[PDB]
Amino acid sequence: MQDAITSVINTYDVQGKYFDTSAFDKLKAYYATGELRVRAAGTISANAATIIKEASAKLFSNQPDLVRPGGNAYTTRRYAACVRDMDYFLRYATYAMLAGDTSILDERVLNGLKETYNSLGVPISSTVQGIQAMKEVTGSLVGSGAAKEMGVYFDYLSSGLS
Amino acid sequence: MQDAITSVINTYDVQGKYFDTSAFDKLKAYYATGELRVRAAGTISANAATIIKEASAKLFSNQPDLVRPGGNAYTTRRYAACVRDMDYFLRYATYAMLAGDTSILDERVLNGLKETYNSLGVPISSTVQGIQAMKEVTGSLVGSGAAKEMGVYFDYLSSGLS
Amino acid sequence: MQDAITSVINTYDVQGKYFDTSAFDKLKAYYATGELRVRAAGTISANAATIIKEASAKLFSNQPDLVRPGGNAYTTRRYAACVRDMDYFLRYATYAMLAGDTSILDERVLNGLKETYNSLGVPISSTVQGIQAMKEVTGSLVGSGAAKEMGVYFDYLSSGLS
Amino acid sequence: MQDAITSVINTYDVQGKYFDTSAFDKLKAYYATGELRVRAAGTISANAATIIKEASAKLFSNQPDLVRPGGNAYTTRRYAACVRDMDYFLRYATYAMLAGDTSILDERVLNGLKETYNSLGVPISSTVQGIQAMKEVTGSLVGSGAAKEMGVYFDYLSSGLS
Amino acid sequence: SVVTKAIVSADAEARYLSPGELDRIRGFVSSGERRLRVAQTLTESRERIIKQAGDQLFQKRPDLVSPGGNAYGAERTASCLRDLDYYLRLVTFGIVAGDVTPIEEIGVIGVKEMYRNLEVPLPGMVEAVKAMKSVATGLLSGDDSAEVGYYFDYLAGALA
Amino acid sequence: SVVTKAIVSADAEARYLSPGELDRIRGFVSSGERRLRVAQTLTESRERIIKQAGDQLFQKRPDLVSPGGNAYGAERTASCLRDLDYYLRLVTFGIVAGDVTPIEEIGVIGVKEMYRNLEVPLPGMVEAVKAMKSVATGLLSGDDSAEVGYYFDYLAGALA
Amino acid sequence: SVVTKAIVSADAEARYLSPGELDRIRGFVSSGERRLRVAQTLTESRERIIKQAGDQLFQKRPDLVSPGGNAYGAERTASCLRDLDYYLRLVTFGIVAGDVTPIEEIGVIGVKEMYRNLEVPLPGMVEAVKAMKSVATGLLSGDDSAEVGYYFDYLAGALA
Amino acid sequence: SVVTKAIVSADAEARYLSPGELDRIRGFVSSGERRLRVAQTLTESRERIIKQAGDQLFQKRPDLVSPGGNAYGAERTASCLRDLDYYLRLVTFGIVAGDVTPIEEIGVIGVKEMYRNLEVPLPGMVEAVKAMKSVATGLLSGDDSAEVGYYFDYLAGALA
Amino acid sequence: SVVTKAIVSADAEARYLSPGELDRIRGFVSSGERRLRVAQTLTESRERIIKQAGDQLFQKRPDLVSPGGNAYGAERTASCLRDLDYYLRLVTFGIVAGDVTPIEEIGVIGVKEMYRNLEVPLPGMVEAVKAMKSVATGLLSGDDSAEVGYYFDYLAGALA
Amino acid sequence: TRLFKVTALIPSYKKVRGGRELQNTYFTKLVEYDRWFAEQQRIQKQGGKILSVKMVAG
Amino acid sequence: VFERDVPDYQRLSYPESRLKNGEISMREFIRQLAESDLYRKQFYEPYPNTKVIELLTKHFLGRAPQDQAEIQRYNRILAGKGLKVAIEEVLNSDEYTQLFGEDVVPFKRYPTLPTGTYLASVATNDEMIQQSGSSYSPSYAGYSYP
Ligand SMILES: CCC1=C(C)/C(=C/C2=NC(=C\c3[nH]c(/C=C4\NC(=O)[C@H](C)[C@H]4CC)c(C)c3CCC(=O)O)/C(CCC(=O)O)=C2C)NC1=O
Ligand SMILES: CCC1=C(C)/C(=C/C2=NC(=C\c3[nH]c(/C=C4\NC(=O)[C@H](C)[C@H]4CC)c(C)c3CCC(=O)O)/C(CCC(=O)O)=C2C)NC1=O
Ligand SMILES: CCC1=C(C)/C(=C/C2=NC(=C\c3[nH]c(/C=C4\NC(=O)[C@H](C)[C@H]4CC)c(C)c3CCC(=O)O)/C(CCC(=O)O)=C2C)NC1=O
Ligand SMILES: CCC1=C(C)/C(=C/C2=NC(=C\c3[nH]c(/C=C4\NC(=O)[C@H](C)[C@H]4CC)c(C)c3CCC(=O)O)/C(CCC(=O)O)=C2C)NC1=O
C-alpha cells in the first residue's frame, strides 16, 4: 500500500530528484489535513457498528427483496456475509482516508472482487448501493468537512465494483 | 527434467522398442563428450561470480540508463534482482550443458518468463544483451569446444525470451 | 513482557485499586527516565556491531581455548553462532532497558537457556564472561547514567545464566 | 551422522592435526572394506522382505504368546507395527554397516527408543530377540565376511536396546 | 503500553527499535505528565462519576432496573455500578499506559461470553459507558476530554 | 540418470555441482562403453533370455501354468512372457541410464495396484525377476554380470 | 511511512486503529513542518554536504582514490560522490516519511549483493555514511541534528 | 563424505540405497588410494605451501603487514599463516572424504560473519587461497592437480 | 439429511458406507412416513402455533412490544411473527431431513451477527422458540412430541 | 507429468469469517502433478468449484 | 520453520522469487522450505522419527502432537515413504488450512483441546534447539590453564 507521502517520495525517486517547492507544498497539504483525518478515523471507528446498522437498514428498506427468500441476502449466513462485507468496505475506506491514497483499496479490496462476486452470485449493483448508504451515513456523522474526504474513497470503491 | 540419455530412453519407450544401433550411436556421442562437459562445468562453477560481474558491468556500461533513476534496475533491490537473474541464467545454462538437453531451461526458467518480464516491465532486449555478455565471458573462460557447447544453451535462453 | 508502567498497573489491578500517590510517584519516575532510555537505545543500536566486536575480542583474548581446535567457538559456524548469541543478549538487554523491566529477559532469553546450553555443550561461564565484557564495552558508549541502568539488565542476564 | 572417514576426520580435527600414518591406515582399511560393504548392502536390499519374513517367523515361533491374544503383537495393527519396527532395524543396520560407524544407530534409532517402548508397553527383550533373529537370517544371505560386519551393528542395536 | 507495543513489534522482527519507534516513545514519555494529571483528575472523582453515570444509565434505560431487568434490585444495581467502576479504573490504566491495552486485555477479551453467561445486555453496556464518557469528559478540559473520550469510545465499540 | 540426479540435487539447493558430483558424473561417463556393451548384449539375446527365464519360472512355481493359475493357457503365458520382455527392456534402459529411474517411472510406480487389478501374484513376479536375473547374468562377463544383477535385484526388491 | 506502518499493523489484526495508533499519527502530522524544514535545509545545501563528505571519506581512506583503489580516477570518484548524493536523497526522504522505510526500500534491500557485484568495500560505505552524517548534522541545529543522526546511523548499520 | 550423502539421501526417502548410489560408493572406494596419496603429498608439503602462499599474499599486499594493517606484527602474521594452515588441513580432509562437506561445515558456514567480526578483509582471504592453490597444484601431478584445484576453487568461491 | 451426512462421512475416508451408515439410512427411510405426518401436522397448524407463541412471548416479555421495544409497532411485530414463521418452516424441514442440517444452514450460521446488526435480543429469540416448542409439542403425540422438541431444543441452544 | 495452473473459488459454508480471506476464496496457483489429484479432491470436498485447469509445463 | 533467523547464504532464493511474483502462496513457500535440504539436515537427520513428528507439528502447526493416533499415522508415513510425504501430510491437513489457510505464516499455538495438548505445546514451543548443528568437529568440556 501507499500513502500520500510515500507517493511523493516514489515520484521524486523515479526521477532521481530532490524535493522542491511542489513536493513540499503537497507534503504540507497532507500534514495540514492530518488532524482532520485522525478525527474522522476516530469518529468512524467508534461508530462502525452504528454506521453498518443504519446503512444496511437503508439498503434493505430500499431493496427488501434481498432479504426475502430468493434474495442474495436471504439466510442468516448470507445476511451475515453481507453486513460483514459492509464492515470490510467501511474499515478499508477508513484506512484509505488515513492514508490519503486509494492504493490499499486496489491492493486489498478490489483485487479480484468483481469476479468473486460474479462467481458467487452477489449483485454488484446492490453492493454499490450499500456502499452509497454507508457514504451517506458516514457523512452525516463525521461532519461536512470530512464528508467529502470520506466520500472520495467510498466513490472509489463504488467505481471499482462498477 | 530429461537429459540426452533420458530423451533417448523416452523415445524408445514410447515407440515400445529396445535400443537400436542409432540409439547406441547417440549414447556413444553423449558419453564421448562427458569429460569435456564436466571440465567446462567445473570451470564455470569456479568462475561464476567473475562471469556475472564482468557481464553485468558490460551490460550496464553499454546501457547506463538501466541502473540510473527511472531505469528498471534502479534500486539496490532492482540491481540485486537483475544480477540474481543473470546468475540463474548462467547456472541453468551450465545444467543444460551437462545434461546435453535444453529441457531444464524450458520447464524451469523460460516457462512464463516472457509474461513475467512483460508484466513487470523488465526490458527483454536488455536481458538478451546481458545473456549474450555472459555468453562472451563464459566462452572466453571455457575454451573453444566448451564455448561451442555452451552457446547452444545461451542462444536457447535468449531465443526463448523472444 | 511488561514494562514499568504495566508493572504498576499489575500491582494496582491485583488489589482492585485506583492509582495512589505512590503509583503516581513510580509513574513519574519512569517518565523522567524516558529520554535517557531512548537516547541509550539509539546509541546501542547505532554501535551494536562495534560493541559485539570488542566484546568478542575480549572474550576470545581472555579465553583463547574457546577458539582453539576443539573449543565450543571453534569453527566458522560455531564462531558465527557465538557472536549471534552475543547479538541476542545485547538486543534483548536493550529491549529490557527500554521497558524498564526484566520480564522480557525471563520470558524470551533465560527460559530454558541453561539446559539448552548444557545440551549444546556451550560453556555457561564463558557466556557470562562474554556478557560481562559486553557490559563494560556498552557502558563506556552509553554514559554513566545510562551505564548504571544498562548494567542492571546485563547483570540480570549474567545471574540468570549462573 | 558420522561414517568411518568422518570419524577419522573428527578425531584429527578436534586436536588441530593433519593426518598421520595411523589415520591413513584407518582410511585404507575402510576403502578396502568398501567393496564388501556395498555387496552386502545390495544383497540385503534385494532380500529385505525375505529377511523380515523369516526373522519375524523365527521370533514368533520362539515366542508364540506375542501374536496370540494378549500379546503385544496381537492384532493386525500391532503385528504390522512389529514388522515395521523390524524394517527400521534392518534398514538402519544396513546404513550403519555401509557407513562403517554406529553413529546413525545411536542417533536415529536408539535415541529415546527405550522410553518409547516403555510408554507404549512394548516388550524390549522380545524386540532384542527379533533383532538377533534378523541377525542369523541376514548372516546366511550376505556371507560370512559380510555376516561378521552386519553382526557388529546388530549386536550394537541389541546391546543398546537391552 | 506504548513501550510494550513498540518493543514487541521490534522483537517479532528480531531487530532493534527503529528511529520512528524511538520517536513515538519519546513523544509518549514527553506527554506523560499531562496524561498523568488526567488520570489523577479522573481518580479523585470516582464516586461522582459512577453515581452520575448510573443515574443517566437508569434514566435512559428504566427497563434495566425495572422488575425483570438484569440490574433489578439493590444488589444487582450495585454490581452494575461496580462494573462501571471497573471500567473507569481500566480507563485510568489505559490513560497512563498511552494505549488501550489494559482495557483490551482486562475488560474486552472474552467480555461477550462473560456478559452472555450473566444475562447482561451488551447494548446496556454501550449506553452505560457512553454515560460514563459524558460524565468523565465533563470534568476534564477540552483536550483532556477528547483524549479520554477516545478510550471511552474504544470501550463502547468493544462492547458493541 | 546419474547426470539428471546430480543436476536435480544441485538445483534443489540452487548451487553449482560440487567437486564430488562432478567426480560422480566423470565416473559415470567413463563407464559408458561397458554399460553400452552390457545393454547391447542383453538386447541381442533378449529372446533367449525371455524364453529360458520363463521356462525356469514355470518350473520353479508351476501353479501359474496349472489350471486355476494366473498364467494358464497360451495367451496368459504369452502375456507373462511379454511382461518379462518389458522388464528386460527397462533393465537395459536402467543400465544405460546408470540408475533405476527409467525402471521406476515406467514399471515400478503403480505396479502394485496394476498387478492387483490383474490378479497377478507379486511373489510370482519376484520369482520371474530372479529367474531372468540368473539367465541374463549367465551370458555376461563377471563384472557385467554383477552390474546387471544389481538392477535385477532392485527390480525384485521393488516387486516384493 | 508512519501512517503506512500503523495501517498495516491495524489491518493485520482486521481492526480499526486504536487510540494509540491515532495518537502516533497525530504526533507525526503535528511534527510535519519541522521535518519539512529539516529536509529543505538538507536539500538546499546538498552540494556542500556531498563535497565535504567526500573530502573526509578520501582523507580517512586515501587507498580508495589511490592506484589500485576502487575510486581511482575522475569517473569513479564521480560515481562515489553520486552514491553519496543518492543516500543523502534517501535520508531526506526518510525525514519527510518519519521512518527509514524509503531508505530501506531504495538503498538497503539487496545493497550487499549490489556492492559485491561492483567490488565496493562495505566499510568504505560505512565511513562515507559517517562522514555525511557529521557534515549534515553540522548544518542543522542540535534538535534537528538529533533526529537526522538516527537516520544516518540506521543507514550506517544497514550497510555494516 | 560421499557415503554419508548417499545414506542421508536414502534415509530421507525411507529406502535402501539404489544401484546408482551403490555404484557411486563403489567408484569412490575404488579411488581411495589415489585420494590418500594426494592428501599425504599435501600433508608433507604443508610448511612449504604455507610459507610460499603467505609470501605471495604479502608481496602483493604490503599494507597488511605494514603499520596499520590487519596482519601487522609477528603474532598477527602468525595468525594469518595459521588460518592458511587451517584451510590446507580442510582441503586434505575434503580430498579424503571425496567432497567439500568437511571444508564447508568447518570453515565456510559463517566464515563471512567470522571475518567481519575479526575485521579481516575477505579479498585478502580469496587472494591467499588462490596463492595456496597455485603453490599446492604446482607440487602435485596434473591429474591430482585438477582434483586439488577443484577443492581450492570451491574454497575461493565460497570466501568470495 | 441423514443420507447427506452419512455420505459425507464415508467420502471423508474415501470409502464405501459401512454397515453402520447403511443401517442408519435404512432406519431413517423406514420412518419417513411418520416424519411426513408430523411435518404435515406442523404445516396445517400455521396460525395457531405462530400466534399462540407470539402471544405467550409478548406476555412473558412485555418490553419487546412496549414503547422503545424492538418489536414495538405493528410492522415490527409483523417482523417478529415472520421470524417465528421462518423458524417453524425450518423446523419442519429439519424434521423431514432427519437432522438439523437444514435448520443449521438456513438459520443458524451467522444468526448471532444477523440479530446483532438488527439489535434483536437473543433471549427473546430463545423465549419465542421455547413458546413455539410448547405449542407445537401440544399438538403432537408423545413419541412425535419428543422428536419435535429435540429440534426446537437444538434451535434454542443455537440461539443461546 | 508436470505443473498445472489451477483457478478455483472456495466459498465459506460453515461460518462467517472476520478476517478478509479474499485470497483464500479466489486463488490461482501452480500445482505440480503428483499433488494435483489430492488438491483437486480437497477443493471438491471443501465445497469449492474449480474454474479452470491448464497444463503449463509438460 | 527453522526456529531462528537464517543467513542470506542459506536462504532459498527461488521460492522467494516465486512468492514475490505471486506464482506460489505462503503455504507453498512453507512447503518449499520444509522440503529443502536445510530442513532435512537440521530437523530430520539429527533425530529419531518419533522426534521428527513432534518437530513437524511444532514447525508447521505451531503445536505438539495431539494424540497417539497422530504419532501412529506419521510414523507409518515416515517408515514407508519418507520425509516429503510426511511434510505434505502436515501441510495438506484440514487443521493447516483452517488455521493458516493459504497466506498466513504458521505461528506458535497453545490449543485448549484435546487434553494434555496445551501443556505439551507449551513445552514444545518453549524448547529451543538442543542438538549440535554439525556432525563434524565436536566440542568438549575442558580448560587450558594459563
Ligand atoms: C539509490 C540506490 C542505488 C545505489 C546506492 C546505487 C549504487 C551504484 N554505484 C555504482 C557504480 C560505483 N559506485 C562507486 C562508489 C564506491 N566507491 C568507493 O569505494 C566508495 C566506498 C563507494 C562510494 C562511497 C564506484 C567507485 C562506482 C564505479 C564502479 C565501476 O566503475 O565498476 C553502480 C553501477 C552503475 C553506475 O555507475 O551508476 C550502482 C548501481 N545504485 C542504486 O540504484
Ligand atoms: C485377530 C487379528 C489377527 C489375524 C487375522 C492374524 C493372522 C495370522 N496368521 C498367522 C499364520 C497363518 N495364517 C494362515 C492363513 C492363510 N492360509 C491360507 O492361505 C488362507 C488364504 C489364509 C487363511 C484363510 C496360515 C497358513 C498361517 C501359517 C503361516 C506360517 O506359519 O508359515 C499369523 C502368524 C502368527 C501365528 O502363526 O500364530 C498371524 C499373526 N493375527 C491376528 O492378530
Ligand atoms: C527407527 C527408530 C524408531 C523405531 C524403532 C520406532 C518404533 C515404534 N514402534 C511403535 C509401536 C509398536 N511397535 C511394536 C513392535 C514391538 N512390539 C512387539 O511385541 C515386538 C516384540 C516388537 C517388535 C519386534 C508394536 C506391537 C507396536 C504397537 C504398540 C501400540 O500402539 O500398542 C511406535 C509408535 C507409533 C506407531 O504405532 O506407529 C514407534 C514410534 N520409532 C522410531 O522412530
Ligand atoms: C512397461 C510397464 C508395464 C507392465 C509391466 C505392464 C503389465 C501388464 N500385464 C498385463 C496382462 C498379464 N500379465 C501377466 C503376467 C503374470 N503371469 C504370472 O502370474 C506372472 C507372476 C506374471 C508375469 C511374470 C498375465 C498372466 C497377464 C494376463 C492377465 C489376463 O488377461 O487376465 C497387462 C494387461 C494388458 C493385456 O491384456 O495384455 C498389463 C498392462 N504393463 C505395462 O505398461
Ligand SMILES: CCC1=C(C)/C(=C/C2=NC(=C\c3[nH]c(/C=C4\NC(=O)[C@H](C)[C@H]4CC)c(C)c3CCC(=O)O)/C(CCC(=O)O)=C2C)NC1=O
Ligand atoms: C577452522 C575454521 C577457523 C578459521 C579459518 C578460523 C580463523 C580465525 N582467525 C583469527 C584471527 C586472525 N586471522 C588473521 C588472518 C587475516 N589477516 C590478513 O588480513 C589475511 C587476509 C588474512 C590471512 C590470510 C589475522 C591477522 C588474525 C589476527 C587478528 C588480531 O589478532 O587482531 C581468529 C580469532 C582467534 C585467534 O586469534 O586465533 C579466528 C577464529 N578460526 C576457525 O575456527
Ligand SMILES: CCC1=C(C)/C(=C/C2=NC(=C\c3[nH]c(/C=C4\NC(=O)[C@H](C)[C@H]4CC)c(C)c3CCC(=O)O)/C(CCC(=O)O)=C2C)NC1=O
Ligand atoms: C430464514 C432465516 C432468516 C431469518 C430468521 C431472518 C430474520 C430477519 N429479521 C429481520 C427484521 C426483524 N426481526 C424482528 C424480530 C424480533 N423482534 C423481537 O425482538 C423478537 C424477540 C424477535 C422475533 C421473535 C424485528 C422486530 C425486525 C425488524 C427490525 C427493524 O425494523 O429495525 C431481518 C432484517 C430484514 C427484514 O426486515 O426482514 C432479518 C434478516 N432472516 C432470514 O433470512
Ligand SMILES: CCC1=C(C)/C(=C/C2=NC(=C\c3[nH]c(/C=C4\NC(=O)[C@H](C)[C@H]4CC)c(C)c3CCC(=O)O)/C(CCC(=O)O)=C2C)NC1=O
Ligand atoms: C476486504 C476485502 C474483501 C471483500 C470485499 C470480500 C467480499 C466477499 N463476500 C463473500 C460472500 C458474500 N457476500 C455477500 C454480500 C452481498 N449480499 C447482498 O446481496 C449485498 C448486495 C451484498 C453486500 C452489500 C453475500 C450474501 C455473500 C455470500 C455468498 C454465498 O455464500 O452464497 C465472499 C466469499 C467468502 C465468504 O462467503 O465468506 C467474499 C470474499 N472479501 C474480502 O476479503
Ligand SMILES: CCC1=C(C)/C(=C/C2=NC(=C\c3[nH]c(/C=C4\NC(=O)[C@H](C)[C@H]4CC)c(C)c3CCC(=O)O)/C(CCC(=O)O)=C2C)NC1=O
Ligand atoms: C531460475 C528461474 C527464475 C527466473 C528466470 C526468475 C526471474 C524473475 N525476475 C523477477 C524480477 C526482476 N528481474 C529483474 C532483471 C531485469 N532488470 C533489468 O535491468 C535487466 C534488463 C533485467 C535482467 C538482466 C529486475 C530488476 C526485477 C525486479 C522487478 C521489480 O521488483 O519490480 C521476477 C519476479 C519476482 C522477483 O522479483 O524475484 C522473476 C520471477 N526468477 C526465477 O525463480
Ligand SMILES: CCC1=C(C)/C(=C/C2=NC(=C\c3[nH]c(/C=C4\NC(=O)[C@H](C)[C@H]4CC)c(C)c3CCC(=O)O)/C(CCC(=O)O)=C2C)NC1=O
Ligand atoms: C533469544 C534467546 C535465544 C538464545 C539465548 C539462544 C541461544 C542458542 N545458541 C545456540 C547455538 C550456539 N551458541 C553458541 C555460543 C557459545 N559458544 C561460545 O563458546 C560462547 C561461550 C558462547 C557465546 C558467547 C555456539 C558456539 C553455538 C553453536 C552450537 C553447535 O552448533 O553445536 C542455539 C541452538 C540453535 C542455534 O541457534 O544454532 C541456541 C538456541 N537462542 C535463542 O533463541
